[PDB]
Amino acid sequence: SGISLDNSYKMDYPEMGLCIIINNKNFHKSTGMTSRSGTDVDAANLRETFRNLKYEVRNKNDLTREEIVELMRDVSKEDHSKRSSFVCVLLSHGEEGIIFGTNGPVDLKKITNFFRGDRCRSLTGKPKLFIIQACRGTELDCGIETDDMACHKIPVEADFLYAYSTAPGYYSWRNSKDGSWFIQSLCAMLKQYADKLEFMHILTRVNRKVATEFESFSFDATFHAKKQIPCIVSMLTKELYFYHH
């Protein structure tokens, strides 16, 4: 055949892949964590959005830390050979590097480690996307008015994309009626640009939407008039388009 290029992930496998959505709204009383009103709006929005992208969506609600780990372990042990990618969306309370099960914390690294290049062979070389809607700390953004070769191996941390809802160390905002700022924006941008733009460019539009169109309203001066900027963390090695051929 003619000249060939390998700058984009192969997304024409028989299946796009799984989209696991963990929606934690109600937490055990003993933890002292508040209910996350509006998260069901996010979960439904994500289900519809990824369904249209042809992902096999699996929604899970109110999972304990043990159930989250068991779920991730089991999913990573499935045969993903006929799948192009993997998507996991986490909706819960959190802090830097941590997501909360209904009864306690789970290290994000523990979850993502199950999908390492060396631990999930059927996903090696394929994009593994983790969308995280959770706090990463307690900071508030006040805003501002405007040679050698051989034995071909790849890093076990390669091909991961972490789309965080907020910057490191910051709270993440969620509206009890409309859903989280980030998920609202992410779904809107995927619906409009998934058949046109490369994923990083779609996420950049999400960054702009969240950064410009949202500002908190609170009777508490400490939490009033605050802003938010999502954080795209890419260890991907190729361009990612949800469409093909």
Partner: peptide, 4 residues
């Protein structure tokens, strides 16, 4: 508006 609420924080997570």
């Amino acid at each position: 508006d609420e924080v997570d």
